[PDB]
């Protein structure tokens, strides 16, 4: 219920959940991660180019789970 939403920098790690995210461009920065549902599911850790956003509290990215354990 509160927004995240914050670009990732060069470098920093993103993570998919492959058993919620909607498409493989769904991604959580890593504080969302580590206080989600989805760090004990499988995931895909890809590191960052620079750019995009996490979206942690985005319903239309997750098949379920959508707000870690801060945004909710
Ligand atoms: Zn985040
Ligand atoms: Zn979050
Ligand atoms: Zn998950």
């Given at each position: 219920?509160?927004?995240?939403?914050?670009?990732?920098?060069?470098?920093?790690?993103?993570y998919?959940?492959?058993?919620?995210?909607?498409?493989?461009?769904?991604?959580?920065?890593?504080?969302?991660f580590?206080?989600?549902?989805?760090?004990?599911?499988?995931?895909?850790?890809?590191?960052?180019?620079?750019?995009?956003?996490?979206?942690?509290?985005?319903?239309?990215?997750?098949?379920?789970?959508?707000?870690?354990?801060?945004?909710?």
């Amino acid at each position: 219920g509160s927004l995240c939403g914050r670009v990732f920098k060069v470098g920093e790690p993103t993570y998919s959940c492959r058993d919620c995210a909607v498409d493989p461009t769904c991604v959580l920065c890593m504080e969302c991660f580590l206080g989600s549902i989805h760090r004990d599911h499988r995931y895909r850790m890809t590191t960052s180019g620079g750019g995009g956003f996490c979206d942690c509290g985005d319903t239309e990215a997750w098949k379920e789970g959508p707000y870690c354990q801060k945004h909710e």
